[PDB]
Design a protein around this ligand. Sequence first.
Ligand SMILES: [Mg+2]
Ligand SMILES: [Mg+2]
Ligand SMILES: [Mg+2]
Ligand SMILES: [Mg+2]
Ligand SMILES: [Mg+2]
Ligand SMILES: [Mg+2]
Ligand SMILES: [Mg+2]
Ligand SMILES: [Mg+2]
Ligand SMILES: [Mg+2]
Lengths: 185, 75, 142, 141, 100, 66, 144, 62
Amino acid sequence: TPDIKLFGKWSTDDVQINDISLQDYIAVKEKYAKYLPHSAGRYAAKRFRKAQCPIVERLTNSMMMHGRNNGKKLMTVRIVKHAFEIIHLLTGENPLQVLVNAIINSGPREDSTRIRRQAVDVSPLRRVNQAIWLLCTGAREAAFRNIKTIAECLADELINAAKGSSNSYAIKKKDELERVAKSNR
Amino acid sequence: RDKLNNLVLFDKATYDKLCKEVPNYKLITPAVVSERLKIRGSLARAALQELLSKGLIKLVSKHRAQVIYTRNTKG
Amino acid sequence: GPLQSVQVFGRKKTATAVAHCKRGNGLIKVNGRPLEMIEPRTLQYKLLEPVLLLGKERFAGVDIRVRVKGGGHVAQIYAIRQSISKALVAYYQKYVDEASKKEIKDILIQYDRTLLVADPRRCESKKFGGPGARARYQKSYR
Amino acid sequence: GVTVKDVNQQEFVRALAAFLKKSGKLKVPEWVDTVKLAKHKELAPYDENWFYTRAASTARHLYLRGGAGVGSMTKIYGGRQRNGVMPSHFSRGSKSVARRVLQALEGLKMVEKDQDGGRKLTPQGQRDLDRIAGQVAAAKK
Amino acid sequence: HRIRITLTSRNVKSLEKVCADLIRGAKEKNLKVKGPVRMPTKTLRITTRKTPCGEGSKTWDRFQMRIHKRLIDLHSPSEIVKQITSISIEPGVEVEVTIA
Amino acid sequence: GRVRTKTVKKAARVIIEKYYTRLGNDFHTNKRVCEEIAIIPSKKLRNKIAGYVTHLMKRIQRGPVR
Amino acid sequence: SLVIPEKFQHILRVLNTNIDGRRKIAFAITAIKGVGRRYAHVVLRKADIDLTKRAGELTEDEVERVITIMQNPRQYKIPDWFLNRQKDVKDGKYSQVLANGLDNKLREDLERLKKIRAHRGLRHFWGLRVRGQHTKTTGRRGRT
Amino acid sequence: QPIKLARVTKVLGRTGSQGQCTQVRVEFMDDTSRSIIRNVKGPVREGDVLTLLESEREARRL
RNA sequence: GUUAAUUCCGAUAACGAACGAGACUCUGGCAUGCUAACUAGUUACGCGACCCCGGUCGGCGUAACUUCUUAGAGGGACAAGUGGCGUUCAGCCACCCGAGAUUGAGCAAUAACAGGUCUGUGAUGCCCUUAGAUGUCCGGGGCUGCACGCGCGCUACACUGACUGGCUCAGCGUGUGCCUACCCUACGCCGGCAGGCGCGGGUAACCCGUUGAACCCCAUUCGUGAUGGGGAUCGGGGAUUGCAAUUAUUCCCCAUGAACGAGGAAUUCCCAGUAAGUGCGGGUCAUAAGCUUGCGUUGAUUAAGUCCCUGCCCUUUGUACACA
Ligand SMILES: [Mg+2]
Ligand SMILES: [Mg+2]
Ligand SMILES: [Mg+2]
Ligand SMILES: [Mg+2]
Ligand SMILES: [Mg+2]
Ligand SMILES: [Mg+2]
Ligand SMILES: [Mg+2]
Ligand SMILES: [Mg+2]
Ligand SMILES: [Mg+2]
């Protein structure tokens, strides 16, 4: 059937990926459109099959961290649902488009490594992975020991990062990573 | 280092403080309302629940972990 | 008149779900309970993948009763998903031309392969000297 | 023609509990407030009228699977017991609540002691549960 | 005249040999049989430290022991079956006779 | 690492010289040829012998093998 | 409804202890020694008090009814097995011991055992564990 | 200083102390003829695009 | 050159061999094809119950059958097919079809260590003692003792949570004993609980038992407060096992409510049904798991590399070392 739309409400179509470096490492489009961010797996068998995972599933997997909630997918699936509900009603557009823009603006574009350190550029896949990882860990440390719940801490983290506010945790880490690599150049 | 002192029941100054602009928030949850008014979450849950009964806010999603409110349609 | 009965099973980790498909009028029940209330309800669109990707008209004329046993909450959900998809394809093979099987099989496969082919992975045994299959206890040099 | 299996069970219990309370023949015991519902709990049930809900719940279970006794009821109402610093285990429910609720539902003709042991749903009881299922279906639709 | 014979053995190759012999012996004496029902295999497991002393890497031994059980029922009186069961038994296989 | 040991290569090289006419080009038929013409005590090296025999056919068809 | 009452008390002074008024009544009573999370709950169900109310919101007469029930549990059908000074060693009376009297009986029991040189009394006198725990490797920072 | 982005054509090999960074040759799609050798961190495929903040440094071959 | 491999190809004063590796056994996956199933089921049929012809029924009974269950025999996968790379050899990468294109274990060489075990042994040399005994039994105590240091762990620091209700899913596997005492439990009454009293089944695919397990899911209360987080320490009372529990065996109830707000230098384990969370069995067991051995269950981030660190293997090389 056509118009496969996430949670039965969010249409995956009309989501544009402006950056061409991350065309084929982001899975949101018609072939990769599903109803839920839950799926069987087999996505870790080969090396580059990791990039064929729908990115909402990738975000969902990365929220199951810090011990207490390993192997709790349904709780995180619920978390993303409510996060997408209030990204829509707070900004007024498709939550999927906000998430895609958050990934692009968050992933670092050059990192430092030991070859005293040497500055190297990052591959598109690791650019996506650090984008997802930074967004989740920013929400996790914001919601800890605080009255505000996890679902909106993730939501406002995405909204801040989608605009490149430099107030979000993810953008602050991105600027710190590249500026150090700038010095090590 | 910093301590929160949230009142458990509305004073008269804060009660209408809620009744005026809170029905114009884009995103109405007990979490956001609790810290915009420095109130207990239980009071925020009760205060938000009685506004729906009157009908000046509309429910968008209800769940155990989170309840989410917005304001009515414009005009 | 003649009975058109097809019984097809579905597999997950350990949950096996076998679906009895007859000629009916579009009734779907799991252990006597319709698909709309099967806990967990958060994974409810999963039970509705085979139906919603195809529409009622292909599921019209057949009545499916699924019995499920074994496994866990999520494992049983995936077993029913595969069982309904396999049973409907097996029904269209035996009593309809496979010209009908062709497009029905491709639309399911193109969505995901596990909806018709069983996932072969299973839990592996624990080895001694560790708490699990591969984790070990702490070394204590000093 | 609706049935218990068709309607959602969570509000079926709440609907049937109200039926028992408005009827007012259940013969609740006198220690319903000072009792702790299981050894693994920590506090008395928050709802003051839990006995009507528990009676509603156990009638639903005898409807689905019959031949259940007190040992079956204390097993089905068990849960995780937290032992402090020790690891948590499984502990069975309270027996006395199982007996009094089962006998309460037996005083007014809902269940009866069938052969092979335990209780099962009396044909009159099967009608009353099917009555409430109709009420649940109509309200939700 | 409802009899059942229980075949239990640790060795399964000879167990299927003995079981096939009795059915063929029954079929040649034209009495109906309900075929061998293969009940689940009971595995006996003992796990023990390899070492007599206390030291060494904590290695363990897994000793198994499987028990295979088969059942044969017959449409016959006791005299015919006695001369069937009295012959062709592997020393591993043990057989009991009961009247149902 | 699918390298065939000596006990597979030696068996195949003996079979090819003594039964060249009977062997074919597909794996499945000459798998049955090898099974009946030599006593191979299990399936796995029966397949591995038959698989190497099939591989040797194509080399032989193109030209000589030392 | 949600507007603060004119007589709302932030602290209630009862049994020579303070009771916070911003806390739920069921958990506000627990602040005095001799009552826990569960003794409080049954007490304010014998006295018909709305659980949803708070300690600073209930009026005085219904407060003083609680103390009468708390100090006199038996006369209001509180079960015998539910007390903490059941069948004491002096007057054999099943009573509920509360904030100030709890420290007096605890002291009396410790010197009762120590007086006659019972083993449990000696360990209390020496400041050591009394319930058979291993003292080799645990409970160290208290003992230097 | 504008940002240039380029595509990989082939993978030379793994370099770095722990062998954690891959050395590749890329061409800029603006000038499809000029090619440069650079060290990239992360799993890199053949035929994907790298976003170069600085494009006039050139890494040595191993 | 190739391989996980002294694995092969190929060179060749070596030729033909042996062990190890591999092969092998068990295990996982899949077969609507076969053998069959009242100690396993399905579907039909006939009654029965309920609801508005139909629907539900682990309610009852029987006619066919083996899909689900069980366990036997075979089958199936071989780098076989296609495209590249390569002495065009051994082989490597990708793709199709496929259930599967590296499942996990068991066994396991020569030579050695003055590694552990004389406290497993009626395996044992020599020495010691042997009647006021280092024999054996009985009574009592200790092996648990507490200024301190270290190792393996359990529970936590909370809201991705705690509490109270409701709903809904397993897989291993044990069970009445040679002496030997001690089994797993259904159901019905009493008790708030631990538990008690009666009847019954089971030597077990037959009964416990459709093993209604936890996490998880849905609905309440709490509101950033060492707080309904946490449950140490400790007082009082009640049971159970035992010949006896005090130095509290274990369990139940009320009360008491400590440190702990993520952990320094340093360091451990691990890459797919894997880590981690979660519970259930067995061993120990009169009393009984914070241990260990297995079982399922929910279920990932990262990586398909390297020799920088710690080490192992091969060749060349240097040595004043050879208990190295
Ligand atoms: Mg929070
Ligand atoms: Mg339960
Ligand atoms: Mg020595
Ligand atoms: Mg001497
Ligand atoms: Mg000791
Ligand atoms: Mg506290
Ligand atoms: Mg607590
Ligand atoms: Mg031990
Ligand atoms: Mg020199």
